[PDB]
Amino acid sequence: LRPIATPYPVKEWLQPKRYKAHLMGTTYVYDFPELFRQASSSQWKNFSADVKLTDDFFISNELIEDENGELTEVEREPGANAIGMVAFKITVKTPEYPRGRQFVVVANDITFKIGSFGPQEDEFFNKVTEYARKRGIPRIYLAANSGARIGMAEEIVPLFQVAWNDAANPDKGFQYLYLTSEGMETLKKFDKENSVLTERTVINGEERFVIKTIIGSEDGLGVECLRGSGLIAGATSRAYHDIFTITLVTCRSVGIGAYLVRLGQRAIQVEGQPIILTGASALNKVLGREVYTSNLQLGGTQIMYNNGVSHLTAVDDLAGVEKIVEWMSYVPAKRNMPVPILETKDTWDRPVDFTPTNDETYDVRWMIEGRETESGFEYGLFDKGSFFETLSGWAKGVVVGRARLGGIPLGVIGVETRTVENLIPADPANPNSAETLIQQAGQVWFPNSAFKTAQAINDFNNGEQLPMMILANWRGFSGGQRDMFNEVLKYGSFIVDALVDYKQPIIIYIPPTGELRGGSWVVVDPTINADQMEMYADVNARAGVLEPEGTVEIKFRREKLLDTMNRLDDKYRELRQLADRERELLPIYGQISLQFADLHDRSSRMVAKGVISKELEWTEARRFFFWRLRRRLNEEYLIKRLSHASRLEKIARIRSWYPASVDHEDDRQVATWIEENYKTLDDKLKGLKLESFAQDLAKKIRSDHDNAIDGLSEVTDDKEKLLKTLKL
Amino acid sequence: WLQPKRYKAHLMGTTYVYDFPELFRQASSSQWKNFSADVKLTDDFFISNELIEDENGELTEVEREPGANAIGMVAFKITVKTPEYPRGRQFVVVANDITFKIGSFGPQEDEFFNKVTEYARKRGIPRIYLAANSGARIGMAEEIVPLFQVAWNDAANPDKGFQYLYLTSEGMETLKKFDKENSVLTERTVINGEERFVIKTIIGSEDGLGVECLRGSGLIAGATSRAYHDIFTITLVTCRSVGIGAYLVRLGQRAIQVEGQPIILTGASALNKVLGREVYTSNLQLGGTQIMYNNGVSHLTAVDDLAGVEKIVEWMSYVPAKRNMPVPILETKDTWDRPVDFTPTNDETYDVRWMIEGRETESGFEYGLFDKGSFFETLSGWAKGVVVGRARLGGIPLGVIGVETRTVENLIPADPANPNSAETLIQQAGQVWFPNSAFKTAQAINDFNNGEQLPMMILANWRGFSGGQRDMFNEVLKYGSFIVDALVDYKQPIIIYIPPTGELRGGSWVVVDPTINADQMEMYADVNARAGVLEPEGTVEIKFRREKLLDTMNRLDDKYRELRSQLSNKSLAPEVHQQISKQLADRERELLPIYGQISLQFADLHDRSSRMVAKGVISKELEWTEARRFFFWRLRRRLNEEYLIKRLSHQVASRLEKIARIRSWYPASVDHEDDRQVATWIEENYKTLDDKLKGNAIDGLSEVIKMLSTDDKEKLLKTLK
Numbered sequence A: 001l002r003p004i005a006t007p008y009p010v011k012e013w014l015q016p017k018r019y020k021a022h023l024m025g026t027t028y029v030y031d032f033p034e035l036f037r038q039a040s041s042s043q044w045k046n047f048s049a050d051v052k053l054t055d056d057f058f059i060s061n062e063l064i065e066d067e068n069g070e071l072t073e074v075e076r077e078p079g080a081n082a083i084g085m086v087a088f089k090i091t092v093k094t095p096e097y098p099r100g101r102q103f104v105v106v107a108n109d110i111t112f113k114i115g116s117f118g119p120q121e122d123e124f125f126n127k128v129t130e131y132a133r134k135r136g137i138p139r140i141y142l143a144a145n146s147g148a149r150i151g152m153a154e155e156i157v158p159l160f161q162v163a164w165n166d167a168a169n170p171d172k173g174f175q176y177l178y179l180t181s182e183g184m185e186t187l188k189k190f191d192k193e194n195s196v197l198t199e200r201t202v203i204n205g206e207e208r209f210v211i212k213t214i215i216g217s218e219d220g221l222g223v224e225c226l227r228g229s230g231l232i233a234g235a236t237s238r239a240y241h242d243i244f245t246i247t248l249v250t251c252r253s254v255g256i257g258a259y260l261v262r263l264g265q266r267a268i269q270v271e272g273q274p275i276i277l278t279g280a281s282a283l284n285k286v287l288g289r290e291v292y293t294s295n296l297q298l299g300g301t302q303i304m305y306n307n308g309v310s311h312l313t314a315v316d317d318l319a320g321v322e323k324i325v326e327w328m329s330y331v332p333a334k335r336n337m338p339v340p341i342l343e344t345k346d347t348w349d350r351p352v353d354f355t356p357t358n359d360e361t362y363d364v365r366w367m368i369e370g371r372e373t374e375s376g377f378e379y380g381l382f383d384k385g386s387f388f389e390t391l392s393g394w395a396k397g398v399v400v401g402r403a404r405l406g407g408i409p410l411g412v413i414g415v416e417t418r419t420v421e422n423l424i425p426a427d428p429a430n431p432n433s434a435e436t437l438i439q440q441a442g443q444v445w446f447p448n449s450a451f452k453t454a455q456a457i458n459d460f461n462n463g464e465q466l467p468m469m470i471l472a473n474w475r476g477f478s479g480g481q482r483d484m485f486n487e488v489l490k491y492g493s494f495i496v497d498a499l500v501d502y503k504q505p506i507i508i509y510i511p512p513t514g515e516l517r518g519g520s521w522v523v524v525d526p527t528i529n530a531d532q533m534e535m536y537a538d539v540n541a542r543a544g545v546l547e548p549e550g551t552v553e554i555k556f557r558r559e560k561l562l563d564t565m566n567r568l569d570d571k572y573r574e575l576r577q578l579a580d581r582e583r584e585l586l587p588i589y590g591q592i593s594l595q596f597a598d599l600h601d602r603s604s605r606m607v608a609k610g611v612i613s614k615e616l617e618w619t620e621a622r623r624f625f626f627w628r629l630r631r632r633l634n635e636e637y638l639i640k641r642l643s644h645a646s647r648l649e650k651i652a653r654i655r656s657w658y659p660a661s662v663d664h665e666d667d668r669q670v671a672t673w674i675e676e677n678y679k680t681l682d683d684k685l686k687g688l689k690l691e692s693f694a695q696d697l698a699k700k701i702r703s704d705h706d707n708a709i710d711g712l713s714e715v716t717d718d719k720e721k722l723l724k725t726l727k728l
Numbered sequence B: 001w002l003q004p005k006r007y008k009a010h011l012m013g014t015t016y017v018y019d020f021p022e023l024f025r026q027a028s029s030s031q032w033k034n035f036s037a038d039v040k041l042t043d044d045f046f047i048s049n050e051l052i053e054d055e056n057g058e059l060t061e062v063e064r065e066p067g068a069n070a071i072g073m074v075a076f077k078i079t080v081k082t083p084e085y086p087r088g089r090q091f092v093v094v095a096n097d098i099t100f101k102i103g104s105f106g107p108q109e110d111e112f113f114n115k116v117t118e119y120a121r122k123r124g125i126p127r128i129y130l131a132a133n134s135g136a137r138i139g140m141a142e143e144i145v146p147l148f149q150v151a152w153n154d155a156a157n158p159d160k161g162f163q164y165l166y167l168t169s170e171g172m173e174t175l176k177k178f179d180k181e182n183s184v185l186t187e188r189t190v191i192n193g194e195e196r197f198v199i200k201t202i203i204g205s206e207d208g209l210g211v212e213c214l215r216g217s218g219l220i221a222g223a224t225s226r227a228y229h230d231i232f233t234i235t236l237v238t239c240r241s242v243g244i245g246a247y248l249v250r251l252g253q254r255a256i257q258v259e260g261q262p263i264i265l266t267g268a269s270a271l272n273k274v275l276g277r278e279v280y281t282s283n284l285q286l287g288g289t290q291i292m293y294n295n296g297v298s299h300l301t302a303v304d305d306l307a308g309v310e311k312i313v314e315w316m317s318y319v320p321a322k323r324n325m326p327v328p329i330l331e332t333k334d335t336w337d338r339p340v341d342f343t344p345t346n347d348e349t350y351d352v353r354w355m356i357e358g359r360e361t362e363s364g365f366e367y368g369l370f371d372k373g374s375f376f377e378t379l380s381g382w383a384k385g386v387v388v389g390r391a392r393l394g395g396i397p398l399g400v401i402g403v404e405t406r407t408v409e410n411l412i413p414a415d416p417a418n419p420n421s422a423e424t425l426i427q428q429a430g431q432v433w434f435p436n437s438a439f440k441t442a443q444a445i446n447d448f449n450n451g452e453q454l455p456m457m458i459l460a461n462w463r464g465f466s467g468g469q470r471d472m473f474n475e476v477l478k479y480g481s482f483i484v485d486a487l488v489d490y491k492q493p494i495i496i497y498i499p500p501t502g503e504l505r506g507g508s509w510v511v512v513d514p515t516i517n518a519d520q521m522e523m524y525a526d527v528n529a530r531a532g533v534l535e536p537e538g539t540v541e542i543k544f545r546r547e548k549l550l551d552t553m554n555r556l557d558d559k560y561r562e563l564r565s566q567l568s569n570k571s572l573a574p575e576v577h578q579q580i581s582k583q584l585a586d587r588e589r590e591l592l593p594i595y596g597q598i599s600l601q602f603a604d605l606h607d608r609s610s611r612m613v614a615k616g617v618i619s620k621e622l623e624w625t626e627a628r629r630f631f632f633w634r635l636r637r638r639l640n641e642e643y644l645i646k647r648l649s650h651q652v653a654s655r656l657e658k659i660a661r662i663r664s665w666y667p668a669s670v671d672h673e674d675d676r677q678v679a680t681w682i683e684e685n686y687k688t689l690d691d692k693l694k695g696n697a698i699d700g701l702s703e704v705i706k707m708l709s710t711d712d713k714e715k716l717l718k719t720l721k
């Protein structure tokens, strides 16, 4: 016992595995449910400080496989795990789900064979993934491992003989490895003849069983571990398209461990915990130099957070768990459940305070979440304190995050107007290589920011199942040599793909001082996904194929300019010396042609051409979007229910059921009627599924009387109900 | 008659649109010559009909005077008799007319392109796009140019500025007279006793000026993204392709770029204006083949339009006539029944292409795994560490992925925009996946799967993914993950084969394991292949350390064992003990190199195809010389069984349940493991098999049972009782 004389029992002595995990710089697996309890308790404190919590607000039940290999909930002592992979089913009452929400936590046990993935860990991880997938519930993975388990046939280590070239001089080499009749008998005695494949030969009157292949009796030595790695990689790839998936890198995550972090997409990396393939030491041996001093140079946060593999960083395990729980607060309790409304003190009915201006620099985040000013807080478009930024360490030209709009959660994409700079590190492996600083102009999509945008669209869509708002403000894609060579076209195309796949309402809004040009409009137009997309443009927004400077250079040339000077200038007209007057007028007429061009680029032309749904005023956008989104979600939910027929037919069907006094165009009135008539519309449609099922059998019976009656006859507690109905 | 437009196109460096069907006729005629020189062709072998919208706006085939196109986008429906489809195959060719408003995309061109895309998609037929354009159509309200007035700050001094632009009552009356009041949005004000109609927005009476072109661009970008998942899509860049035109090339994925024809976003001139310097001299510095073929946007290059059309027609020869039709078998003189001649050796460097398609040698041709002359390499200008292409195996077409074992080097160009930037040469070791080669592998898997609908073989030979700083920073994990995604989505048979001298390690095995897609994937390893988590040096470092090395020396070395034995005496003088220990340690030092080698062999003996077979991770261990004969019948049998699974899917279930049912129909004497026997039986019985194939609720029951007759109720009561 160390230390002695502590006020309470030494938890690191009661379970020595807890100390082993601490020695490795991570939390003991069986202590992670407690960290979830703390983070969930903190959630309530930040939401409503006055709320009193009972210990039944949070429930953690370990999941283990029974005799049949089926997952079952158990209460047992920490550290009784016969495999290096553990799981817990968590049931929490949260501010967004006061009656409770569930999720699954899968985790490597770093104390069990250094958290290596053997066939049993892989098959358990897969079973847990499938369990969460069948239930539609989130899958949290706590990665603390050393990749696929490595082993050798230990029973062959004390038996194998060496066939020397010269037994007197071992440095002269060997020809093969073999077993003696004794070695073969040893294996037969222990039922391990199958551990090796041998070819019998006779050298100097003695039997030599030359070893042709070593198999081993123990499972988990090599390729079988690789098979299991492939299984769970495929399982995670699938899971991401199905349920909310997230990973916390709590200690190292190696090989398959690194691939799982990426395949689950959403990742939170604890500072100092690397995500690696081959380690630095091994890479030094292969390279034949001491190139790297740490694994952090390969997969630390300075690598994975900067390249977007890690969406967020955490100072420690609890901070990471807090970030998981916060990220989940925007996500439905389970697949296909409505987005979780969390109304705070910042309600919908207010103007937007912070407004950008054409001549002044701003941070988009002020437009999104508001800005703290000396005169007080200037509220933004979304709920105060609701912006949860992600992928914040990578491709800073685009700003992605979750936010709330009057309590409605959604994904948000905004454009960083300020110039962004990133440091490409100097690789110690190449001495010729030096560190490089790249500068990227604002309101231009580059390969990395185009990739980030597509990634964000995909991560809001899959698992999160969130609606989205893109505050579209791009001049286009970088058409320069470097960026074209660096495949900007491929990354831009991913955006279209991501939009085509989107299954929740999308709002494209060109904001005040914002613009969309030829190259950028193409990848965000609502005709890409007309079932879900809508575009709006602010009254102070701009859009055209080219910028005014370009549209004047091509369509308002010298001939037009001079014909204008003749129409509008007394001196020029009197004269038509003319070249001298032309020189005098060139600056101001240049401004006039630019204005003439700019007057085509307005939200009013956009409305007239039928390319946007409405032109909007920024200060009123919060009030407008709140009711538009509330309405759009309410209709979507009805469409999904009505799927139990084209969407175009379903929307025409739904919008017809509205009382005649309801103005279809009135979002608030439509959204209000749907929510008030929900229980009634739940009844009205179930009572028509039954009316159809009644007419279904009334067809089958009237066509095939005695044959259907015999079918009814063929098809305990259900029989009792059916008896009661006959009895009346 | 067409000579002016034909010359205009030639001046641009492209073929006149209405002359492209002829280029397809030539390329199709050449296909037959290369296949069978003695075959005589009639004019009915090739049919081109123009597609136009009817009264109902529906696409219809027509014969009309070429050059009669009222829009800058034209389409043709082609019906060709090819070596792989002698009775004929169909496809659609969409093309910009470079002579019609410089091939710009206006609302009408976009809506036509979309209608043609949808037409091909509904029919399952390939969509060929011939890109020759200048992107979205640019315009201004020309009727407002001679009407607008300037509201000066001081009419006597124009340089003092202006406040707005306006129309007079005259201007407003002119527009009213021509039915164009809607061309502008105005605000009425009175200045100096005269009406000023302040211009708030210019709309214009002419359609196709700006945002309505941009909407149409978005429509066709979405349409092409969808088309790629649905039908075979390919693009030939025949003149410049700009903006939406550049995006269309990428969104259709498969692209053949004619040399000197650039794929660009903003042109060099405009970029020079924005940058405020003469940075670039040509569009080719931005989107020429030296850019797009080197980065994989362009899969292939062509010296001219006919060469490009020839490459389209060749690529199509591996592709089904239409979606979900079986892969087109094209048996040539190189039949299945032969060994594989070219064999790699561990000590001699080789080009994988020799293993794939064979090698011409002084002693004669050394045949490879696939049919002689069938290897059609693609993405050959980018990420050269991986080799991708279409090939034929006894006439069966398939996608092939192989590993370039030789070190690859690529030149990153110096951007004229950054003077501080210099050209860089990157060197990548063979048998290692880097970001670009991982991306190329995933791209290839996706392109064989979507539209092409081909089976695939991966000649797996990777030590892993590059785990170094540069490649990790350059997101190798993201590109490696795309491989898993691409495999999960695959819908045709996959064969993973670790070839002779080949290997698969911890990082590389994870992304190709058949448990990723058990319905379609299978793994095999050559008898001279290797696989383990780590390479032998790695394994001994973790699992055959000092203590194990010393224990072996104690077992196998006389001197070491004798000395260790001497340390058991309890009467030894401490200085004698120290000398025995020193001698023991000296002996250990002498033996460490050779015992290290022993441990390496001990490790290597675990890494064999026989352990792989014993562990059940591969289906069979194979001999390279017999692989062609083996894979031909394996693939033929799988294509046959796949066909039966689909047919059964329609009549009725899991894949496990579906093959089990189908295989239960095979005669009992048929060995399910005998590929040739199963394929032979199936093909002899397609028609017989076709005959076999052709041959809350409780509340609902409660509602209907209630309406039954007394006699019916009695029977239903008895059953419950």
Ligand SMILES: Cc1cc(C(=O)N2CCC3(CC2)CCN(C(=O)OCC(C)(C)C)[C@H]3C)cc2cn[nH]c12
Pocket: A441, A444, A475, A476, A477, A478, A479, A480, A481, A517, A519, A545, A546, A547, A549, A550, A551, A553, B265, B266, B270, B271, B273, B274, B275, B417
């Ligand atoms: C004909 C014509 C068009 C335009 C125009 O509409 N844009 C200019 C180009 C951009 C889109 C808007 C803005 C930067 N950009 C780009 O490719 O930048 C690459 C790096 C970043 C390398 C400079 C395009 C996305 C302006 C002018 C000025 N003179 N003549 C013009």
Ligand SMILES: Cc1cc(C(=O)N2CCC3(CC2)CCN(C(=O)OCC(C)(C)C)[C@H]3C)cc2cn[nH]c12
Pocket: A277, A278, A282, A283, A285, A286, A287, A429, B429, B432, B463, B464, B465, B466, B467, B468, B505, B507, B533, B534, B535, B536, B537, B538, B539, B541
């Ligand atoms: C512990 C241990 C493991 C391994 C091992 O199994 N591999 C070595 C690493 C590689 C995979 C096989 C080969 C190159 N490689 C890589 O990341 O290379 C990056 C650049 C290209 C930058 C050198 C891995 C894909 C060998 C040794 C030798 N001593 N100790 C070892």
